[PDB]
Design a protein around this ligand. Sequence first.
Ligand SMILES: *C(=O)c1ccc(-c2ccc(C(=O)OCC)cn2)nc1
Ligand SMILES: *NNC(=O)c1ccc(-c2ccc(C(N)=O)cn2)nc1
Ligand SMILES: CCc1ccccc1
Ligand SMILES: Cc1ccccc1C
Length: 9
Amino acid sequence: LAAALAQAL
Ligand SMILES: *C(=O)c1ccc(-c2ccc(C(=O)OCC)cn2)nc1
Ligand SMILES: *NNC(=O)c1ccc(-c2ccc(C(N)=O)cn2)nc1
Ligand SMILES: CCc1ccccc1
Ligand SMILES: Cc1ccccc1C
């Protein structure tokens, strides 16, 4: 999940 969101940055 972290990566799925972190892709924004
Ligand atoms: C949410 O973005 C997210 C993505 C990927 C993972 C995750 C956890 C563990 C592995 C892995 O290969 O573990 C082997 C011990 C890969 N991806 N978690 C959360
Ligand atoms: N929000 N995105 C990031 O912080 C981020 C974007 C892209 C990458 C990344 C990592 C590794 C490669 C590669 N060719 O090995 C390319 N892009 N990391 C973080
Ligand atoms: C694509 C997720 C990510 C974001 C920032 C740094 C590394 C990786
Ligand atoms: C590992 C991680 C966690 C939360 C936001 C961004 C990144 C790259």
